[PDB]
Design an enzyme around this catalytic site. Structure first.
Site, short mmCIF file in Angstrom:
data_model
loop_
_atom_site.label_atom_id
_atom_site.label_comp_id
_atom_site.label_asym_id
_atom_site.label_seq_id
_atom_site.Cartn_x
_atom_site.Cartn_y
_atom_site.Cartn_z
N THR A 45 0.88 -1.21 0.00
CA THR A 45 0.00 0.00 0.00
C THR A 45 0.90 1.23 0.00
O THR A 45 2.12 1.12 -0.06
CB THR A 45 -0.90 0.07 1.27
OG1 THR A 45 -0.24 0.84 2.29
CG2 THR A 45 -1.19 -1.33 1.81
N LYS A 63 -7.47 3.28 4.51
CA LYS A 63 -6.17 3.36 5.18
C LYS A 63 -5.95 4.60 6.04
O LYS A 63 -4.99 4.67 6.81
CB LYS A 63 -5.04 3.29 4.15
CG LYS A 63 -4.58 1.89 3.75
CD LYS A 63 -5.51 1.19 2.79
CE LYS A 63 -4.83 0.00 2.08
NZ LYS A 63 -3.78 0.40 1.10
N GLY A 86 -2.74 7.36 9.46
CA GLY A 86 -2.82 6.41 8.38
C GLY A 86 -2.08 5.16 8.80
O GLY A 86 -1.18 5.23 9.65
N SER A 98 4.62 -0.06 0.56
CA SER A 98 5.39 -0.52 -0.58
C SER A 98 5.61 0.56 -1.66
O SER A 98 6.48 0.42 -2.53
CB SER A 98 4.71 -1.74 -1.20
OG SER A 98 3.42 -1.43 -1.67
N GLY A 144 0.70 4.82 -7.12
CA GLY A 144 -0.22 3.81 -7.60
C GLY A 144 0.10 3.33 -8.99
O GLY A 144 -0.14 2.16 -9.31
N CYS A 149 3.72 1.28 -8.36
CA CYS A 149 3.59 0.17 -7.41
C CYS A 149 2.46 -0.79 -7.73
O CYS A 149 1.27 -0.42 -7.81
CB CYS A 149 3.40 0.66 -5.97
SG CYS A 149 3.54 -0.66 -4.72
N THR A 188 -0.37 -1.05 -5.08
CA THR A 188 -1.19 0.10 -4.71
C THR A 188 -2.14 0.50 -5.83
O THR A 188 -1.77 0.50 -7.01
CB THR A 188 -0.33 1.32 -4.33
OG1 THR A 188 0.54 1.65 -5.42
CG2 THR A 188 0.52 1.03 -3.11
#
Lengths: 173, 393
Positions: free
Chosen positions: A1, A33, A45, A124, A156, A159, A162
């Site tokens: 995430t 989150k 978070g 991550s 996002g 990764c 994500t």
């Protein structure tokens, strides 16, 4: 995430994605989150156990309880209990909490870190988030929310763990 | 009509070497109790004791000062170890005990103080009782109203022949412990000590620093801070239930004492910090300090030893160098091994005299002179050998 906190002017935010992964498959895609704590005075978070967080955020909010509200002290007092108690010591998760005063990272290793310019990028995708959050905070007048969000989308994109589902919280002062 | 601070510090100087600030500090506390009585009803209530917190290493005077202060004021005094109460998380004991234990000792006081402020008179009246058995001499009327009045004549000569000379002696003692009692009022005696505790009580709390914090662990800090918490009422003003009545801690003076090497007075809980308005540091003693402690106090251990040997008909004399050599010994062991402050003088001095202390009864009539040589002859080896030190000194 990926969780990204940014603080510019009288605003400080914490944004996170919504993907939850298991193996190579996406379990959920709208995980929340980010959330508000301590009578909405504190925004936090978490990267990890969607429940481990629950347990942690509460205890944290228990620290801010009878410690005036000193974010930093209650934060170090938490990591303290966290790294000790077998119960707490058991759960693993990255904590990113901010507030009018300052934002910082809390870990299981009883570690309380405060990035450079109160800029946090865990999970991550934290690195990607940060690299982008930097390029902006550095060469741009964009708000704390615009960078956190734009930096979060960039993460996002790179990764594999994500997604582009956001959950943002803010604090004005 | 109490003494002034300087006067109090002075009396204190008669027993404690150095540590002047701690004296002045404890001195102002006392003077203020006088100062309080000197006010209007209103203020007498609002003005609370200016409790003190002593910060300093072991055996450098903290307790002694507290003890001598209490003596000087003739105030009931009690010493208590803070950590004692952390044990309550198992069974321990309750803090109220401090005020109760204080009262008990404050009674043992008023009693022995009274039984003494009477034992004399009770002895005279005792005579008139015995002297009465030998002869009721005089009486209302019986002879002349002037020259033949006074009965004393025979009685007097009888009296003397008795004081200097059943069992008159055996009987008198029974009469002493019969007349003295019939002269004491146990009611005013019980309320006696209570007034004392409330008006002059002094509580010395050692180890207050062993009750602070450190992110050490949740469980231990809770118990620790528990004792502080439980200490508030006693210090903020409350009422404790005593075997001899009820007491108002409200004016008891408190002298908290802490080394504070690990923990700081700021770590103390807020409501207590505010009740320890006076903070004072005491310094570690120096070899010089030791030499002075060895001989200056008007009842110094050296003066003490002299007397005991005299009891045996032996004249002991300490040499200046001998005294210095002794102090040095104590210092060296404290540094070579474990530093226990002036307490070490007692062990060293005592080991130095073992042989004489034993042979004294035979040396009767001699002039023993403890000099530098004698000292080195008896201590150096021990001092030198560390392991031996840890067991013998």
């Amino acid at each position: 995430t990926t969780i990204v906190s940014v603080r510019r002017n009288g605003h400080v935010v914490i944004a996170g994605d919504g993907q939850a992964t298991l193996g190579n498959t996406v379990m959920k895609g709208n995980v929340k989150k980010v959330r508000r704590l301590y009578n909405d005075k504190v925004i936090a978070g978490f990267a990890g156990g969607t429940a481990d967080a629950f347990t942690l955020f509460e205890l944290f909010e228990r620290k801010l309880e009878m410690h005036q509200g000193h974010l930093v002290k209650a934060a170090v007092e938490l990591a303290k209990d966290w790294r000790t108690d077998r119960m707490l010591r058991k759960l693993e998760a990255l904590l990113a909490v901010a507030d009018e005063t300052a934002s910082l990272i809390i870990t299981g290793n009883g570690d309380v870190v405060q990035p450079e310019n109160d800029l946090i990028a865990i999970g991550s995708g934290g690195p990607y988030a940060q690299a982008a959050a930097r390029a902006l905070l550095e060469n741009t007048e964009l708000s704390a929310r615009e960078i956190a969000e734009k930096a979060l989308d960039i993460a996002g994109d790179i990764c594999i763990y994500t997604n582009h589902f956001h959950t943002i919280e803010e604090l004005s002062y | 009509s109490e003494m002034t601070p300087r006067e109090i510090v002075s009396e204190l100087d008669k027993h404690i070497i150095g540590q002047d600030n701690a004296k002045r500090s404890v001195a102002i506390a006392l003077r203020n109790r006088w100062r309080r009585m000197q006010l209007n009803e209103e203020l007498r209530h609002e003005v609370t004791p200016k409790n003190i917190l002593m910060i300093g290493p072991t055996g450098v005077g903290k307790t002694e000062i507290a003890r001598r202060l209490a003596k000087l004021a003739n105030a009931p005094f009690i010493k208590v170890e803070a950590t004692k109460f952390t044990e309550v998380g198992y069974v321990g004991k309750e803090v109220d005990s401090i005020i109760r234990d204080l009262t008990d000792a404050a009674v043992k006081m008023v009693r022995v103080q009274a039984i003494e402020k009477n034992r004399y008179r009770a002895e005279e009246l005792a005579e008139e009782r015995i002297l009465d058995v030998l002869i009721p001499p005089a009486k209302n009327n019986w002879g002349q109203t002037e020259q033949q009045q006074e009965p004393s004549a025979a009685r007097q000569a009888f009296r003397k022949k008795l004081r200097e000379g059943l069992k008159i002696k055996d009987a008198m003692k029974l009469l002493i412990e019969e007349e003295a009692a019939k002269l004491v009022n146990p009611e005013e005696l019980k309320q006696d000590a209570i007034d004392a505790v409330e008006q002059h009580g002094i509580v010395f709390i050692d180890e207050i620093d062993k009750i602070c914090k450190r992110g050490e662990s949740s469980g231990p800090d809770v118990s620790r801070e528990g004792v502080q918490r439980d200490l508030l009422p006693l210090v903020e003003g409350c009422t404790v239930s005593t075997k001899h009545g009820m007491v108002k801690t409200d004016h008891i003076l408190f002298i908290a004492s802490g080394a504070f090497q690990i923990a700081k007075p700021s770590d103390l809980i807020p409501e207590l910090q505010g009740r320890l308005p006076i903070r004072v540091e005491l310094q570690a003693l120096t070899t010089s300090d030791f030499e002075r402690i060895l001989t200056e106090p008007n009842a110094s251990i050296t003066v003490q030893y002299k007397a005991l040997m005299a009891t045996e008909g032996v004249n002991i004399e300490f040499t200046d160098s001998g005294i210095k050599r002794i102090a040095e010994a104590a210092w060296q062991v404290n540094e070579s091994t474990e530093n226990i402050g002036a307490r070490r003088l007692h062990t060293v001095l005592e080991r130095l005299m073992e042989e004489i202390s034993y042979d004294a009864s035979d040396l009767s009539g001699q002039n023993i002179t403890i000099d530098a040589d004698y000292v080195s002859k008896h201590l150096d080896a021990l001092v030198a050998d560390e392991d031996l030190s840890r067991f013998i000194l």
